[PDB]
Chain length 68, copies 3
């Protein structure tokens, strides 16, 4: 009985795949982190009004096409 | 022959790493889900025109700097 | 001693989990790729000014509420 050699290569095989996965997992984390740090902006309200961007918020455009 | 004890701790080791990976995988999924639900907006056309945001779309600013 | 059968099912078990993980990892990659390709836009400056979008950049709205 040497089924200990087949079991060994089988564990070695799984271990390699786990190493590859740990790598893709690390890559994924760095990509998600960058996406999170990009500071993207959410959608403007969907209320039939036009919006412009100011101080991290959507402000009504008509607000500036009037004095006040 | 006790190489069954070394094989056991080796499987235990891989299993722990797989547990850690399952965790980072779950964390990644929750982060990607939130990024997907944030409702970010795509780029405006790159055609030399100015755009404002309205009803989930980029509309030409000049459209409002005119009556119609 | 058949602890070789228990070790076998244990490796089989870990291998299945590793297969599931490889799948969730692949799914995550396709989702992150799409998020990266969506071409979202970063925040406008936070300087108290109103901005509109033009040619892949935030341009001051007042720039168009004046001839030049």
């Amino acid at each position: 009985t040497n089924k200990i050699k087949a079991i060994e290569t089988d564990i070695a095989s799984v271990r390699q795949e786990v190493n590859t996965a740990k790598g893709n997992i690390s890559s994924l984390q760095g990509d998600v982190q960058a996406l999170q740090e990009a500071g993207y902006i959410p959608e403007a309200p969907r209320d039939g009004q036009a919006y412009v961007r100011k101080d991290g918020e959507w402000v009504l455009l008509s607000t500036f096409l009037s004095p006040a």
